[PDB]
């Protein structure tokens, strides 16, 4: 029922004879590419996915023939191709909520002189779906970029608005992946959960990036799932007291307005 | 070796043991969703793809469990979901060639008071990789990853003109089947553009994509990205044919040459 966190891993999941393993694997290959690791061969993809290299070889050959990868003639290495951009825009275009939310986000971004964004979860990350900047505006586009769940304000609000058992399951995953730092990670999360219960937002005061503060408010939506709106920026421009006393309350009111306008 | 236009055709995996048919079929399902077709059920997807309904059912079930589709609990209909963006949307919106092209595109857009874009082909469409609007330009921006049809747009024509002889004919033979009724009307407009490219180095679309939009495009052959195409276009009353042929087109050719010399 919940979205798979680790689709290449067999676990306690009872068998699923409908599941199309080759489709899962080929899409996982595309997910190996990152801004720093943007050119990859079959060996690195096999090490990243844990798949046999001959299996990877069939998938990258197929992805090239379909236009989702391209292969450099000299090196043999692969890179993402622009079919992926077309798919992403088709996805973004079903977010009708943006026509109501974006003007309201720009008003808040202009007041706070900071970025306001809308995000949703995929696996253990939050993904930016729409970003507006204060009229004090860079070249890098941020739609589709990702933030970790536990330390960002958007991930904390997403976890806060989650059912208790589902949060526990995702948190198990994070805990078993970072055993050394988990007590510290969890304390930061516990504090954000108290803020959600007490005030209806979550903060990240330098806990995603040390120089950055942000506040976030979730919106549970029947079609889209849990959407999260945040406002954040340099901690010098947005000290904790400003987020608690001013921006956080404005963000709450903004989300109620969006929520009341969206069927 | 040319990118497949019809990957679900007969006998691919037979000629090519490396071809993973189930992966092709799932991506063909995801391609059914477009900016204007946002919600589809299994039967619409079977009709669009030609695949049997039980086959589509396995593919969509898989895509939902993975987070690439979502399913409405009451209606059973599907939509693309957030996991699609993790396949690489942000990285492709941030190609490093933008750091060379974008400021040059801004200068042209400011001068022309019109939008300047960078595009590349995917199957029978041109996909926008970057778009810059002139300072004080109040035309609605086309979005990153939006598409234009190949045959009637300036960007598609320039792409076809920069192609190898044979690849162009293969694509065009393919376009003659999708649209037999108006093909001689598509052929004539394309032959004009190919002639313009041979003679002058650009391609025009004077209202041949949308009636009140005119645009000029210039291709660039790049060793890594393939054929990139740059265009400059806008309201036809602002950009008459004469302005595009005498002023914008030549400036766009010089811009592409500058881009070409700065990214080796
Ligand atoms: Ca509502």
Report CB contact under 8 Å: A90, B35: yes
Tokens standing for residue A182 = 């988990």
B71: CA distance to ligand 1 center in Å?
19
Cα separation, A204 vs A185, in Å, equals 12
Residue tagged 């079977």 (tokens): B46
- Please enumerate in sequence order all residues whose Cβ is within 8 A of that of B239, keeping only pairs 6 or more positions apart, or say none: B112, B114, B214, B215, B232, B233, B248
Cα separation, A232 vs A140, in Å, equals 17
Tell me the C-alpha to C-alpha distance, in Å, between residue B6 and each of A101, B10, B24.
39, 9, 10
Residue B149: CA count within 13 A, CB half-sphere: 12
From the candidates A40, A49, A89, which should be mutated to test the interface with B, based on the most B CB atoms within 10 A?
A89
A96: CA distance to ligand 1 center in Å?
13
Nearest to B126 by CA among A78, A89, A83: A83
Please give, rounded to a whole number of angstroms, the shortest distance from the CA of A82 to a CA of chain B: 7
Please give, rounded to a whole number of angstroms, the shortest distance from the CA of A263 to a CA of chain B: 15
Cα separation, A172 vs A169, in Å, equals 5
Domain ranges of chain A: 19-81, 97-263
Tokens standing for residue B183 = 């093909």
* A-proximal residues of B, 135-194, CB under 8 Å: 143-147
- Which spans in chain A are helix H? 21-31, 42-49, 53-66, 83-92, 97-112, 153-161, 164-177, 182-199, 240-242, 248-261
Cα separation, B157 vs A144, in Å, equals 31
β-partners of residue B232 are B116, B216
Interface contacts (A, B; CB < 8 Å): 209
Report CB contact under 8 Å: B19, A57: no
Residue A223 CB neighbours (<10 A): 14
Report CB contact under 8 Å: B19, A87: no
Q: Is the dihedral of CA A113, A206, B83, B5 positive or negative?
A: positive
Burial class for B42, CB neighbours closer than 10 Å (0-12, 13-18, 19+): buried
Tokens standing for residue B205 = 């679309």
Tell me the C-alpha to C-alpha distance, in Å, between residue A64 and each of A25, A45, A83, B57, B134.
15, 14, 11, 25, 36
Q: Residue A100 in 3-state DSSP?
A: helix
Angle of helix A97-112 versus helix A248-261 axis, rounded to 10: 160
Tokens standing for residue B155 = 């960007």
Tell me the C-alpha to C-alpha distance, in Å, between residue A180 and each of A148, A175, A177, A257.
17, 9, 9, 42
Report CB contact under 8 Å: B87, A30: yes
Distance of CA A166 to the CA centre of its chain: 17
**What secondary structure does DSSP assign to A36-90, as a single string?**
SS-SB-HHHHHHHH---HHHHHHHHHHHHHHTSEEE-TTT--EEE-THHHHHHHH
A228: CA distance to ligand 1 center in Å?
14
- Residues of chain B in contact with residue A146, where contact means CB-CB under 8 angstroms, are 86, 90
- Please enumerate in sequence order all residues whose Cβ is within 8 A of that of A179, keeping only pairs 6 or more positions apart, or say none: none
Nearest to A58 by CA among A23, A34, A86: A23
Please give, rounded to a whole number of angstroms, the shortest distance from the CA of A51 to a CA of chain B: 15
Cα separation, B233 vs B184, in Å, equals 25
A79, B96 contact by CB (below 8 A) = no
Tokens standing for residue A236 = 């010098």
The answer to whether A27 faces chain B, any CB pair under 8 Å, is yes
Nearest to B208 by CA among B196, B220, B219: B196
Nearest to A111 by CA among A216, A260, A251, A240: A251
The answer to whether A20 faces chain B, any CB pair under 8 Å, is yes
Which resolution, in Å, applies to this structure? 2.0
Residue tagged 């061969």 (tokens): A41
Residue A219 CB neighbours (<10 A): 22
- How many residues would you count in chain A? 263
For chain B, how far is it from start to end, CA to CA, in angstroms?
Answer: 24
Pairing of strands B125-132, B115-122: antiparallel
Cα separation, B231 vs B248, in Å, equals 10
Nearest residue in B to A71, CA atom: B224
Q: Which secondary-structure segment (H or E) carries A130?
A: strand A125-132
Phi-psi map region of A46: left, alpha, beta (phi>0 left; psi -120 to 50 alpha): alpha
Nearest to A120 by CA among A101, A106, A140: A101
Phi, psi angles (nearest 5°) of residue B155: -65, -40
Q: Residue A218 in 3-state DSSP?
A: strand
- Please enumerate in sequence order all residues whose Cβ is within 8 A of that of A114, keeping only pairs 6 or more positions apart, or say none: A134, A231, A232, A233, A237, A238, A247
From the candidates B90, B104, B159, B226, which should be mutated to test the interface with A, based on the most A CB atoms within 10 A?
B90
Nearest residue in A to B91, CA atom: A35
Nearest residue in A to B122, CA atom: A83
The full 3-state SS of chain B, as one line of letters, equals CCCCCCCCCCCHHHHCCCCCHHHHHHHHHHCCCECCECCECHHHHHHHHCCCHHHHHHHHHHHHHHCCEEECCCCCCEEECHHHHHHCHHHHCCCCCHHHHHHHHHHHHHHHCCEEEEEEEECCEEEEEEEECCCCCCCCCCCCCCEEECCCCHHHHHHHHHCCHHHHHHHHHHHHHHCCCCHHHHHHHHHHHHHHHHHHCCEEEECCCCCCEEEEEEEEEECCCEEEEEEEEEECCCCCHHHHHHHHHHHHHHHHHHHHHHCC
Report CB contact under 8 Å: B84, A82: no
Tokens standing for residue A235 = 């901690």
A187, A195 contact by CB (below 8 A) = no
Residue tagged 């959960």 (tokens): A193
Residue tagged 């008459």 (tokens): B240
Nearest residue in B to A126, CA atom: B82
Residue B93: CA count within 13 A, CB half-sphere: 24
The answer to whether A8 faces chain B, any CB pair under 8 Å, is no
The answer to whether B5 faces chain A, any CB pair under 8 Å, is no
Phi-psi map region of A127: left, alpha, beta (phi>0 left; psi -120 to 50 alpha): beta
């Amino acid at each position: 029922k919940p979205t798979m966190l680790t689709p290449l891993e067999a676990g306690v999941e009872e068998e699923d004879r409908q599941f199309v393993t080759a489709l899962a694997r080929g899409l996982e290959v595309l997910r190996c590419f990152t801004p720093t690791e943007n050119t990859l061969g079959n060996q690195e993809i096999a090490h990243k996915t844990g798949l046999p290299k001959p299996t990877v070889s069939r998938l990258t050959h197929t992805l090239v023939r379909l236009g989702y990868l391209r292969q450099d003639a000299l090196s043999g290495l692969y890179q993402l191709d622009i079919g992926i951009l077309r798919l992403g825009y088709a996805m973004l275009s079903n977010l009708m909520i943006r026509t109501v939310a974006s003007p309201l986000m720009q008003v808040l971004a202009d007041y706070a002189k900071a970025a306001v964004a809308m995000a949703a979860r995929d696996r253990l990350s939050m993904v930016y779906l729409d970003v507006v900047q204060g009229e004090g505006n860079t070249m890098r586009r941020q739609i589709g970029s990702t933030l970790p769940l536990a330390g960002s304000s958007v991930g904390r609000a997403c976890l806060a608005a989650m059912p208790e058992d589902e949060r526990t399951f995702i948190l198990e995953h994070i805990r078993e992946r970072e055993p050394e730092n988990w007590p510290s990670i969890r304390k930061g999360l516990d504090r954000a959960l108290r803020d959600f219960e007490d005030y209806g937002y979550c903060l990240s005061i330098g806990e995603w990036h040390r120089d950055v503060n942000s506040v976030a408010v979730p919106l549970v939506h029947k079609q889209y799932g849990v959407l999260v709106f945040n406002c954040g920026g340099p901690s010098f421009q947005l000290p904790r007291e400003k987020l608690e006393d001013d921006i956080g309350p404005r963000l709450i009111e903004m989300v109620h307005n969006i929520s009341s306008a969206v069927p």
